[PDB]
Amino acid sequence: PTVIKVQNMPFTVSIDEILDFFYGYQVIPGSVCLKYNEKGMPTGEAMVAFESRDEATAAVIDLNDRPIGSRKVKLSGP
Amino acid sequence: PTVIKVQNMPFTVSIDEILDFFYGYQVIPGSVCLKYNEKGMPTGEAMVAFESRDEATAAVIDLNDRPIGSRKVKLSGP
């Protein structure tokens, strides 16, 4: 269960949205961790893990550049 | 790449406070990831990255069990 990187998120996201964005994918519900900066504000980045390595590879390829609200998100890893 | 987990932080913590905890080490900026469960609630846990294995090992051993707020933080990694 590799973890993948998720960038360029709107800063209006929620945890439900991120998980929904991965609907149909073998994602781990309590694996999301949101990155913030020194000023206490989100950076639009987060880490998300899945049940397998082929499921993380499948997400990155399949959902890269796709949108969460308005922002087209960028995926990488593992 | 060399990330570590942090646990036992009060549920309400700021990044500015966390960075204070890791002063003197090369914590990759913006890498501080706050974790959430499948309910989308604060876990008191985070992930943090360093540039080398050496600095993530150096942080885990020195700072392990020090406070952030009123709790003795627990480090695990790389």
B1-78 folds as Alpha-Beta Plaits (3.30.70)
Beta-carbon contacts of residue A24 (< 8 Å; ≥ 6 apart): none
> Which residue's entry shows tokens 């695990």?
B76
Q: Which residue, among A59, A74, A56, has the nearest Cα to A2 in the 3D structure?
A: A56
Structure resolution, Å: 2.4
How many Å apart are CA B29 and CA B31, to the nearest integer? 5
- Gap between the Cα atoms of B70 and B78, Å rounded: 25
Method: X-ray
A28 exposed, middle or buried (CB, 10 Å; 0-12, 13-18, 19+)? middle
Do B30 and A14 lie within an 8 Å CB cutoff? no
- Candidates A13, A78, A15, A4; CA nearest to A43 is A13
Contacts of B36 in chain A (CB under 8 A): 15, 30, 32-34
Kindly list the domain boundaries of chain B, sorted by start residue.
Answer: 1-78
Closest partner residue to A15 (CB to CB) among B31, B40, B47 is B40
**What count of residues does chain A have?**
78
3 state DSSP class of B21: helix
Is B20 in contact with B67 (CB distance < 8 Å)?
no
Burial A6-20 (b: 16+ CB within 10 A, else e): beebeeebebeebbe
b/e per residue A34-73 (b: at least 16 CB within 10 A): bbbbeeeebbbbbbbbbeeeebbeebbeebeeeebeebeb
Nearest Cα residue in chain B from A35: B33
